[PDB]
Amino acid sequence: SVQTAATSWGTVPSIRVYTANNGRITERCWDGRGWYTGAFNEPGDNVSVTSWLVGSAIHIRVYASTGTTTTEWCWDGNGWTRGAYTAT
Amino acid sequence: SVQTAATSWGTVPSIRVYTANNGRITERCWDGRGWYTGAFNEPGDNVSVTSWLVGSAIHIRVYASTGTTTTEWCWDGNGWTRGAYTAT
Amino acid sequence: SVQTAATSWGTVPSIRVYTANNGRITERCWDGRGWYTGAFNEPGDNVSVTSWLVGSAIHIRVYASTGTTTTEWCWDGNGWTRGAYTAT
Numbered sequence A, B, C: 001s002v003q004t005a006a007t008s009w010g011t012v013p014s015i016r017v018y019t020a021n022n023g024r025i026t027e028r029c030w031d032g033r034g035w036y037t038g039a040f041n042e043p044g045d046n047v048s049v050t051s052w053l054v055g056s057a058i059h060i061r062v063y064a065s066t067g068t069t070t071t072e073w074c075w076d077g078n079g080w081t082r083g084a085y086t087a088t
C-alpha cells in the first residue's frame, strides 16, 4: 500500500504527514486550521521524517528512498533542498 | 515483513509501538511496568505515528494506510476516533 | 525499495537514520560534523525508531522486524542490546 511518515511540533500542533504513493512523496499539513497540501513533492517509494526546533524555527528532514538511493530533503525556513546525507 | 511505528514521551518513558501485520494494526505499550497490548486495533497495511504533549496530556495521531486510503486515528485522552485527515 | 527511520535530538542536532536494505539494518549518524556510519548493524527488513532524553543522556529504541518477528534494540549510553519488547 501507500506508506506514510509523520512529525509534529508545538501545542496547536503543526503536523506534517508525508505519503509515498506510486513512486512519489507528497506532503499534507495541519497548522490548526484544516489540512492542506504542502510544497514538498519529490520522487520516493519510502519516506521517513524527523524535525526539531531551534528557538522558534522548525527544521525538517525527509529521507526519500527510491531503489537503493536515499535522498535527504531539508526544510530550514525557505524551501526544500537536497541535504548532504548519503547511505554509504 | 511486518511494519512498525514508534513514539515515546516523558522520562519513564511511555512508549507506544504500532505494528501493521497481515492487514491490521495493533498497539504495544510500555509505561515503565512491562509491555502490554493497547486498545488500538484497526485495519492497515502501513502505519506511522506522531505524538505531542499539551501540559500533562498526551495526544497521539496514527496514520493507517490500506491500499491508497489513509485514515488518521486520534487519541486525545478518551479513546481512539477517526480524525479529519485526508490525503487529497 | 529500502526503508528508513529517523530520529533527532538537541539543537545541533544529532540525527540518526536507520536503513533496512537487503534484510539488514544499518545506521548513519550526524552530530554536526559530517555523516558517518554508526555501530548499529542487525537483521531487519523493516525499522522504526524513537528516542528520548533523560537529563543529558540519549536513549534510543530501534524496532527491527524480519518476517513476523520484531526485536527491540536499545541504546542507553553503552552499546546496543536486545530489549524486553515482544509483539504478542
Ligand SMILES: OC[C@@]1(O)OC[C@@H](O)[C@@H](O)[C@@H]1O
Pocket (backbone or CB within 6 Å): A016, A027, A029, A037, A038, A039, A040, A075
Ligand atoms: O505551507 C506550509 C509549509 O511551508 O510548511 C513548511 C513545510 O512543511 C512546507 O513544505 C509547507 O508548504
Ligand SMILES: OC[C@@]1(O)OC[C@@H](O)[C@@H](O)[C@@H]1O
Pocket (backbone or CB within 6 Å): A061, A072, A074, A076, A082, A083, A084, A085, C030
Ligand atoms: O543544513 C543542512 C544540513 O547540514 O543539515 C544537517 C544535515 O541534515 C545535513 O545532511 C544537511 O546538509
Ligand SMILES: OC[C@@]1(O)OC[C@@H](O)[C@@H](O)[C@@H]1O
Pocket (backbone or CB within 6 Å): B016, B027, B029, B037, B038, B039, B040, B075
Ligand atoms: O492502556 C494504555 C492506553 O490507554 O494508553 C493510551 C493509548 O495508547 C491507548 O490505546 C492505550 O490503551
Ligand SMILES: OC[C@@]1(O)OC[C@@H](O)[C@@H](O)[C@@H]1O
Pocket (backbone or CB within 6 Å): A030, B061, B072, B074, B076, B082, B083, B084, B085
Ligand atoms: O481533534 C482532532 C483533530 O482536529 O486533531 C488535529 C488533527 O489531527 C485533525 O485531523 C483532527 O481531526
Ligand SMILES: OC[C@@]1(O)OC[C@@H](O)[C@@H](O)[C@@H]1O
Pocket (backbone or CB within 6 Å): C016, C027, C029, C037, C038, C039, C040, C075
Ligand atoms: O558513534 C556514535 C554513536 O555511538 O552514537 C550513539 C549510537 O547511535 C551509536 O550506534 C553510534 O555509534
Ligand SMILES: OC[C@@]1(O)OC[C@@H](O)[C@@H](O)[C@@H]1O
Pocket (backbone or CB within 6 Å): B030, C061, C072, C074, C076, C082, C083, C084, C085
Ligand atoms: O532498559 C531497557 C528497557 O527496559 O527499556 C524500556 C523498554 O524499551 C524495555 O523493553 C527495555 O527492556
